Design a protein around this ligand. Sequence first.
Ligand SMILES: [K+]
Ligand SMILES: [Mg+2]
Ligand SMILES: [Mg+2]
Ligand SMILES: [Mg+2]
Ligand SMILES: [Mg+2]
Ligand SMILES: [Mg+2]
Ligand SMILES: [Mg+2]
Ligand SMILES: [Mg+2]
Ligand SMILES: [Mg+2]
Ligand SMILES: [Mg+2]
Ligand SMILES: [Mg+2]
Ligand SMILES: [Mg+2]
Ligand SMILES: [Mg+2]
Ligand SMILES: [Mg+2]
Ligand SMILES: [Mg+2]
Ligand SMILES: [Mg+2]
Ligand SMILES: [Mg+2]
Ligand SMILES: [Mg+2]
Ligand SMILES: [Mg+2]
Ligand SMILES: [Mg+2]
Ligand SMILES: [Mg+2]
Ligand SMILES: [Mg+2]
Ligand SMILES: [Mg+2]
Ligand SMILES: [Mg+2]
Ligand SMILES: [Mg+2]
Ligand SMILES: [Mg+2]
Ligand SMILES: [Mg+2]
Ligand SMILES: [Mg+2]
Ligand SMILES: [Mg+2]
Ligand SMILES: [Mg+2]
Ligand SMILES: [Mg+2]
Ligand SMILES: [Mg+2]
Ligand SMILES: [Mg+2]
Ligand SMILES: [Mg+2]
Ligand SMILES: [Mg+2]
Ligand SMILES: [Mg+2]
Ligand SMILES: [Mg+2]
Ligand SMILES: [Mg+2]
Ligand SMILES: [Mg+2]
Ligand SMILES: [Mg+2]
Lengths: 185, 183, 58, 159, 172
Amino acid sequence: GIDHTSKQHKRSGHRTAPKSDNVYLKLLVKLYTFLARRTDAPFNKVVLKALFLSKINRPPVSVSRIARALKQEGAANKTVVVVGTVTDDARIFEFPKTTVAALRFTAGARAKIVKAGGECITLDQLAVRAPKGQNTLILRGPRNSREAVRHFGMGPHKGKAPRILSTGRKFERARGRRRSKGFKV
Amino acid sequence: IIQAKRDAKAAGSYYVEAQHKLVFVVRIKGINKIPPKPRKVLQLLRLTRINSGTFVKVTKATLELLKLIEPYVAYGYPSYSTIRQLVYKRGFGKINKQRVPLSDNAIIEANLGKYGILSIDDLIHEIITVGPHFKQANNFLWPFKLSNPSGGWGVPRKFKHFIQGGSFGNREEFINKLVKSMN
Amino acid sequence: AKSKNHTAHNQTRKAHRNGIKKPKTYKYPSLKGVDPKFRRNHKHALHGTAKALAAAKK
Amino acid sequence: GKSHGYRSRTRYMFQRDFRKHGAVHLSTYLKVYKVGDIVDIKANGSIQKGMPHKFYQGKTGVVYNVTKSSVGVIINKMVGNRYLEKRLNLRVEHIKHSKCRQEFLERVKANAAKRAEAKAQGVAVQLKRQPAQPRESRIVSTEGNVPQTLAPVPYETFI
Amino acid sequence: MAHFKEYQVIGRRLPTESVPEPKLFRMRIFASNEVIAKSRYWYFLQKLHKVKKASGEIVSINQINEAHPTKVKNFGVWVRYDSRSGTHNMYKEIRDVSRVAAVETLYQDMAARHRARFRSIHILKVAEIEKTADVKRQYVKQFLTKDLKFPLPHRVQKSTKTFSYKRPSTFY
RNA sequence: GGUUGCGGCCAUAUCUACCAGAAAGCACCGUUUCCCGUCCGAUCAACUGUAGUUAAGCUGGUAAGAGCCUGACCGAGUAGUGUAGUGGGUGACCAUACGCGAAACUCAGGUGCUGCAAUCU
RNA sequence: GCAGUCAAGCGUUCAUAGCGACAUUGCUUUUUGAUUCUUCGAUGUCGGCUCUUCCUAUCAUACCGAAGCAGAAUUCGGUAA
RNA sequence: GAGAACAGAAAUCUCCAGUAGAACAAAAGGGUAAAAGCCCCCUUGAUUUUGAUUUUCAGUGUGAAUACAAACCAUGAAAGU
RNA sequence: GCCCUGAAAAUGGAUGGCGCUCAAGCGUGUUACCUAUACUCUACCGUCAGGGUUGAUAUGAUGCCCUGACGAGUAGGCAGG
RNA sequence: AAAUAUGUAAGAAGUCCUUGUUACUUAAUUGAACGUGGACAUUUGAAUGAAGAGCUUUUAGUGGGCCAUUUUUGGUAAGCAGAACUGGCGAUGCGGGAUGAACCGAACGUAGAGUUAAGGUGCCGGAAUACACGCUCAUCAGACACCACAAAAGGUGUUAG
RNA sequence: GGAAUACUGCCAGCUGGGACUGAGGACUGCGACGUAAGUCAAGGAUGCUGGCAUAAUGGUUAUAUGCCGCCCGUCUUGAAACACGGACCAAGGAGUCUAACGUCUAUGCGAGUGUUUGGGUGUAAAACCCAUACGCGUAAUGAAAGUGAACGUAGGUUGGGG
RNA sequence: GAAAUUGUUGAAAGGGAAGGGCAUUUGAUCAGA
Ligand SMILES: [K+]
Ligand SMILES: [Mg+2]
Ligand SMILES: [Mg+2]
Ligand SMILES: [Mg+2]
Ligand SMILES: [Mg+2]
Ligand SMILES: [Mg+2]
Ligand SMILES: [Mg+2]
Ligand SMILES: [Mg+2]
Ligand SMILES: [Mg+2]
Ligand SMILES: [Mg+2]
Ligand SMILES: [Mg+2]
Ligand SMILES: [Mg+2]
Ligand SMILES: [Mg+2]
Ligand SMILES: [Mg+2]
Ligand SMILES: [Mg+2]
Ligand SMILES: [Mg+2]
Ligand SMILES: [Mg+2]
Ligand SMILES: [Mg+2]
Ligand SMILES: [Mg+2]
Ligand SMILES: [Mg+2]
Ligand SMILES: [Mg+2]
Ligand SMILES: [Mg+2]
Ligand SMILES: [Mg+2]
Ligand SMILES: [Mg+2]
Ligand SMILES: [Mg+2]
Ligand SMILES: [Mg+2]
Ligand SMILES: [Mg+2]
Ligand SMILES: [Mg+2]
Ligand SMILES: [Mg+2]
Ligand SMILES: [Mg+2]
Ligand SMILES: [Mg+2]
Ligand SMILES: [Mg+2]
Ligand SMILES: [Mg+2]
Ligand SMILES: [Mg+2]
Ligand SMILES: [Mg+2]
Ligand SMILES: [Mg+2]
Ligand SMILES: [Mg+2]
Ligand SMILES: [Mg+2]
Ligand SMILES: [Mg+2]
Ligand SMILES: [Mg+2]
């Protein structure tokens, strides 16, 4: 017998491969597995990890987010890397010329980038151009802006978006939501 | 030390030897029915299995731990011979959270060389003389997995104090006989 | 048919299974209970400092 | 029925420290508390306003708010299997400056001085505290101290 | 506890700034090993003086060997023991060639006759009775007569085999 | 060093009984027109500092003083208590082992220290 | 319910032949409680009749010890189911 | 306690002692002495606004309470409350 | 201290049984010895973890391989079949 | 007025220094809080450990418990009834206590060898009818904790005081 | 006075007997011995020899022997229970589908998304194609009238992978 | 043309159930090389 100080046979709790059966995603994972093993590039390791992420853990990155990241000082000529989808954003009117590497480009995002004069490349093209992640800028979309997230941690005095099907007057607004009816929250 | 004792006796004095700086502790109790404070102390001394043993540097902070775990351990003052045989036969290093036998001085140098410990004898020296890097060397040493004593425990019942004819507590110099039988 | 009334038996074991977690101290604690007069002046002082440091960028 | 009022079981807790009843001395009110100060909570039973609950008697917290006659103290209370932040509004008669950090503060000052002297003189620091160490060897003399032999005494009653 | 040795144990009641060189108290302890000897020293010292192992130190511990281990002595032994219902002092006499042998005999005899375990017994004193006719116990005096001889009737020989073919004899 | 005003700690400062106190201060003390308050100028108010006194207050000293304060290998490593045993004992309870460790008691010492301002033989 | 210990007293005098206060130690489970462990997909609920066996804290019978046993009668006790 | 007509053991007056041995609506505990008690004077903070906090606690409600803020007031010479 | 009296219950029966008396009992001491799914070492299964290896004849990178640790289980969850 | 238990602290989010904001605060740049700038890495400031730390979502079952040591209430008491802490059983086999949910030992993948735990070694039964000093004779002897009970009072039984 | 011996401890002193194991599978390492060639007990067994070549080993099965082994399921704190169901066997026999949903995941597209109400078409309930709407989302908040999201590089600070 | 259940034949065992686990003996039977 052993007095165990920790749970036995505990899985790491991190993905070691994509749940997806996408053969092309698996090819990208194989390439970046080789790169992360045999380059000692932290970029390669983080890209390999990001290739495993689920859909909610790869929120889309808009071209406006990319443009703000390029407005960062000294980052204007860096290749922007999004392990996920790059979406279009018409709220921005001045997109700069740049190289973006992404898993997927929306038609509109690709059109905007090409029109601004840059290029949209895949992650294997990124790997060939920058095997050590040279001159890269990894961008990630907003995870906690998901609609599901605003209902997390619901409770008294939390302000956390009750799970509700119909909204308006008569729908969870009277007793427990105002001092005039019992109490508030 | 021998000459100091002889000289004090010749001068009509008594040479009080320095208090022991090192103890070897062996958990002699199983893992069932242990109160939480002694259980936590045994975990913190890395004695999570019966007949698992570790070296402890003696301070007030660790003597108050030995006091708490007294009914579950047999401990005492290890000799050079005991330490040498323990490290040579059952010396394992904790390398990358893995238990690696100390079969070559290169292993010891690769993991403890930054502290000046280049070989198994350097490790043993850092253990027996509680050196500046005793904490690091002792922690690098995986807890020793001893067997049951080859000639038995010498007593009918292990779980009264050594003073009361049992096995636990401070058996100060007889820990060498016990550990040599268990090693 | 009477039953058991109360016991704290096993409750500390349950608590320590996922442990007694220390409350994750942060730099810049919240100003929830701070005196509102102090908070009003603090807002004005911080705004003034921000404006001064904005002009200080030369 | 059972009784759990606010001051239940406070009979001895909130008593006035025999032969120390009456008015609070002026140093209590002359102490100055700043946000961030560490304070021990000990309720004065003669000041019924701004009194802490009995749970906080003997707890040490950090001042987060300073008002006319009181301070706000941050306590970490064990609730269930985790700690919750509690904010008490205590009049200054129920708190005092904690000395739980003064040893550390003078140690920091002395460590700065020792480091300065070390970097002005040579190379040795030894700035960490150490537990009490095993005693070194010593020679005990018998000059005027010849060992006196004791024996266990026989039993007697002396009643 | 076991086959006994005798130790001198000298302890100090550790020096302070006010009282350097404390009074160096010594005891003669019968114990099977030095660990038990020092434990017993602290036990009796805590019974006698304001000291404990945490506030004192063992200055010396030395085995005392019998001066004349091959001469038969008569020993007077004063003990104090706890019975089931009280505490009693007793004086006994033991014939043996060493103090440790006499003390082993005494512990055996106390356990046999009064069911007094080691923990319940304090050896107040062990002393050689130098002059016979100061021996005051008959069970020792009967062995101090001149030209003492006695037979050993009914000798029982231990057989090394299960079966014997002889119907043995108890002659001696 | 004395004294006053304001104090800090709040008896080592309190209490009991005596003795002493120079200078200044403080005080008791003298007076009732005014402001003011009383059954009562006793308290409180006001006026004089003049008529008087250290009697008292006050301060200090004394006492095998009471109390209080401090210390102790004083009692006592006692009582108690954390931990241990397939220890004792029918039990009540107890002993031992590894630790922590009182109170009463006894003895010894002590009896306000001190900040700010002003003042004084 | 049954049985002990002590022995202030009763018993003409005498604590204990026979008793025995104030106390106190027990045993038994043929009382009644206390509890709610078993049984509510069911163990047939009074008593008697009948019949066997067991216990002994013995009523009788056998043999005994004690007596405030002259005899007789009786009482206390022992081995005894 | 020592005193004063009726007046005694208890009525009112006087002094001395008096650490609270009284009183504070009520149960009990805590607290309180130039007061929190007794008496007197003035009053309406037992008001307005909406938050935070403590106890019970799920860190929900309710009750009760704490410290502020923004007003308007009461009292006092005032600090304050 | 041990032993004895005190010491009475019901089917025949329990130091577990036999039986044991300088014990095969009681107290105490010393050794040797016996044996758990525990401890030590080794193999094998699985799980978990850390790594190596897309440089070729390479079809099994979910592959092959190296290293270390671990394995109780109702209700229950999940996984691979 | 303990012991046990218990709050806090033991650094870079630290210590100190210079001076900017404000409608707060002060008689007053007085301070308060927040800032700008500057110095201080071997022990960055006790020990030991750290199959890492932190974070989130979502759901199962459960919401009759019981037992042991110790603390402890009601009760004459209970294998009774009710609390405290821990350890267990439930949910657990295995070796031991003959037997037994909870006691002792020890927790369990499949095997081999070695050694042990608790408990034992006359025979059942693996293992000394071992060694040693005493004690005990019972016409109801005694024979290992939990545990399967015995007391007061007595005995020139016998032993030692 | 000079020794010895016991006891305890140490040796990187020598050596005999017994048992279990032989995992791995080119080399690579650390060493030892040797001046060096090379050898070795140094990152896991080889060498030599015999018999048999089949029921001999082994498997299966029945039996015997030693030791162990209560009847499952269920409710329960607790079941082998003097608690319940079960004489036996076969076949049948119990978390399903639907509407609307929460979390998570996969996929398509993405500020949009959803062809399938319907129309077109067809090798005819399939597949293929499609307009206008409509649903959800892109805006919130208030009881409502109503109003409705950049001071700033869409902010400052602390941390933050890359 | 299953099982329960049954007849016959053959084999085996059988002192108040039977059945089961580990191990081997014996009998029968059999694969691999
Ligand atoms: K029933
Ligand atoms: Mg295991
Ligand atoms: Mg052996
Ligand atoms: Mg044993
Ligand atoms: Mg319940
Ligand atoms: Mg108090
Ligand atoms: Mg006057
Ligand atoms: Mg006046
Ligand atoms: Mg005078
Ligand atoms: Mg005095
Ligand atoms: Mg135990
Ligand atoms: Mg019950
Ligand atoms: Mg039935
Ligand atoms: Mg029936
Ligand atoms: Mg019937
Ligand atoms: Mg009879
Ligand atoms: Mg007043
Ligand atoms: Mg209420
Ligand atoms: Mg008897
Ligand atoms: Mg036996
Ligand atoms: Mg014996
Ligand atoms: Mg892996
Ligand atoms: Mg499992
Ligand atoms: Mg259950
Ligand atoms: Mg268990
Ligand atoms: Mg039993
Ligand atoms: Mg095994
Ligand atoms: Mg045998
Ligand atoms: Mg008796
Ligand atoms: Mg030797
Ligand atoms: Mg091989
Ligand atoms: Mg065969
Ligand atoms: Mg059986
Ligand atoms: Mg069952
Ligand atoms: Mg039954
Ligand atoms: Mg039923
Ligand atoms: Mg039926
Ligand atoms: Mg079927
Ligand atoms: Mg047919
Ligand atoms: Mg058939």
